[PDB]
Structures are given as structure tokens and as C-alpha cells.
Structure 1
């Protein structure tokens, strides 16, 4: 009667985020005596009674400062959803995790058989720049990053290149950038670095 559906292993590139689909079941008669349903995710081998949860829907339970905001329960727990969302992954997050349910004095249960193994790989993904290119046009660029979440603390950008003097010599921190390619700027390496408060992406210009 106590079942938990979730993949056993999961991978995420440090700094990015992933969504761990999860579903769970437990015996519940369903009559009006309806005490609240509290679920938790813990680090492997911790004791429910004394541990700060990595994630929970219990308003009284203290959450690990390290996971506050990065690990969040998605979906309605009242609808069998234990889906987890890990954001701004960190190497420290690597390890095993388990889910627990509690409802009334009777329902209490840790799914120690269905642990969740999380491996935090290194960040190899490169930012992105998203077809004009006319000498004298107000083209606007945008340097974002795939697999990113607005989980942790906002990212920081800084553009590099020789073609950064035609206009503002300081308004180049924004994610998006407006620029009118002045002629001389052709086949010039344009870069965009990023940090989470340092990977980059270099592209070659082309004016016509």
C-alpha cells in the first residue's frame, strides 16, 4: 500500500537544475477525520525526528539553509505528487535522498527502498546568443543559459570583444544587448561570460 515511483539515479551539471518526477501512495480510508498530509525529502541516513529537511510542505519544519530555494516540491502533494525540483545544482548536493510521508498518528513512512541518487557533474554547457546583421540596424542580442533556473541568486554577465566601443562602454552587463553593428566590426570575436554571483560563449560577427 506504500508505493513510491521515482527513477533511482539523476544527473545535473553544477549550476543548472533538473526536475525529478515523483509519485507516491499510502493507505488512507478517506473519511472526514482529515489530518494534514506532510511529506519530506531527507539526506540519506538522517533521522526524520531530528533532521532539517532538504524539502517539505510542513510549514513548521525547518529546511536546510543549503537547500532553501534550490530544492522545491512541485505539484500538489495532495495529489500523489512528490516531484522534486533541484536548482542551481552544487557538487555538495551529490548523494542519496529519501522521501517520507506522515498523516495522522497512523501514517508515517520513509521510502528507504526507493532512495534517490543524485550526481552533480561539472558545467560543460555554454551560454547562448539568440537573423539580421545589417550595417546600421538596431539588432538586439540575448545571452542566456540552457538548463538554468531562477532558483539560486541571479546570474552575472559581462561581454567581451573589440566591437564593444561603438556604443555605451558600460551598458554591457544586461542579459540582452541592443547594438547597431558599425561597419569596421566584422568577423570580430564576441564573448559573453557568466557567473552565479566562469564559463563563456564566443561567436564571430558578420556584417552585410
Structure 2
């Protein structure tokens, strides 16, 4: 009657983030005496009684400072959902984790047979630059630099574009995610680069000003 559905292993590039679909079941006498349902996600081998959750729906249980903000229980706990959202991954998060349910004095149980093995890899993916593809001189167009599979989980990502085609403008307006520019002819073929840090990921593109 105590079942938990979840893929056993998971992977994420450092700094990025992933969602772990999870479902769970437990016996419920189901009558009016309906006490609160509390769920926890702990690190492997920690004792429910004395550990800080990596994630929990209990508003009294303290959460591991390291996982606060990055490990969140998506979906509805009252609806078999134990899905875990893991953001701004860290090599440190690498490890095993188990899920626990507690409801009333009767329902108490750790799903020790279904641990979640999270593995954090090194960040390879580089940012992205998007636009309409006009590339006409004397015609301003905005660019959108963004990193794939990222969450607004941890500390925001700092932008900064580099290039010779940036001189014809204010060094200030060169920190946003988006950016406009009236491309010049000397900018055509220029090497522009968008950098990102969470408070070495670069994307350098040759400008095609027609």
C-alpha cells in the first residue's frame, strides 16, 4: 500500500536544473479525521527525526540552507505528487535521496527502496543568442542571450556582451539579457560575445550586417 514511483537515477549539468517526476501512495483510512500530510526529501542515510529536509511541505521543519531555494516540491502533495524540482545544480548535490510521508500518528514511512540518485555533471552547454535575422545596417534590432535548461532558482545570471560592434554604444546597456543596436558596416563580420555568471559560458557570433 506504500508505493513510490520515480526514476532511480538523474543527471544535470552544474549550474543548470532539472525536474524529477515523482508519484507516491500510502494507506489512508480516509474518514473525516483528516490530519495533515507531510512529505520530506532527505539526503541518503539521514534520520527523519533529526535531519533538515532538502525539501519538505512541513512549515516547521528547517530546510538544508544549501538546498533551500534550489530543491522545491512541485505539484500537489495532496495529489500523490512528490515530484522534485532541482535548480542551479551543484557538484555538492550529487548523491542519493529518499522520500518520506507522515500523516497522523499511523502513517509514517520512508521510501527507502526507491532512493533518488542525483548526479551533477560539469556545465558544457553555452548560452544562446536569438533574433529575427534582419542584420541591416542603420536598423536597430534586439538580441536575446539566454542559457538552456536554466532556472531562476539560485542567484540570477549576470550578462555582459563583448565585441568591436559594441563601441558605437554605451558600455552600460551591455549587461541586460536583451540588447538593441543599430548595426554599422564595420560591425558586419564582427565577433560579439555574451558571457554569464551566477552572481565560463560564452557564445561568440559573427555579425552578418547586410
- TM-score greater than 0.5 by the shorter chain: yes
Partner SS, residue 167 of structure 2:
coil
Deviation at 1:207, TM superposition (A): 1.0
Q: Deviations over 1:30-89 (max 9, x none)?
A: 100000000000000000000000000000100000000000000010000000000000
**C-alpha distance in 2, partners of 1:69/1:169?**
33
Q: What residue is the counterpart of 1:20 in the other structure? A: 20
Aligned to 1:200, what secondary structure does the other structure show? Answer: strand
- 1:103, distance to aligned residue in structure 2 (A): 0.2
Superposed CA RMSD: 0.6
The runs of 4+ residues in structure 1 deviating greater than 3 Å are none
Alignment partners' CA distance in 1, 2:172 and 2:39: 48
Q: Which runs of 5+ in 1 are unaligned?
A: none
SS at structure 1 position matched to 2:186: coil
TM-score (norm 2): 0.98
1:96 matched residue in structure 2: 96
In the TM superposition, residue 169 of structure 1 has moved relative to its aligned partner by 2.3
Partner SS state of residue 78, structure 1:
helix
CA distance in 1, matches of 2:146, 2:171: 21
CA distance in 1, matches of 2:77, 2:6: 15
**In 1, distance between residues paired with 2:155 and 2:169?**
29
What residue ranges of structure 2 are gaps of 5+ in the alignment?
none
Q: How far did 1:170 drift? A: 2.3
Find the counterpart in structure 2 of residue 201 from structure 1: 203
TM-score normalized by the length of structure 1: 0.99
Name which of structure 1's ranges 104-113 and 164-173 shifts more when overlaid on structure 2.
164-173
- Once the two structures are overlaid, the 10-residue window that deviates more, 155-164 or 43-52, is 155-164
Q: How far apart, in 2, do the equivalents of 1:169 and 1:33 lie? A: 64
Q: Could you tell me how far apart the structure 2 residues matched to 1:192 and 1:207 are? A: 18
How far is the alpha carbon of 1:2 from its aligned partner? 0.3
Aligned residues: 208
After superposition, the C-alpha distances for 1:142-162 in whole angstroms (9 at most, x for unaligned) are: 111110001001010111111
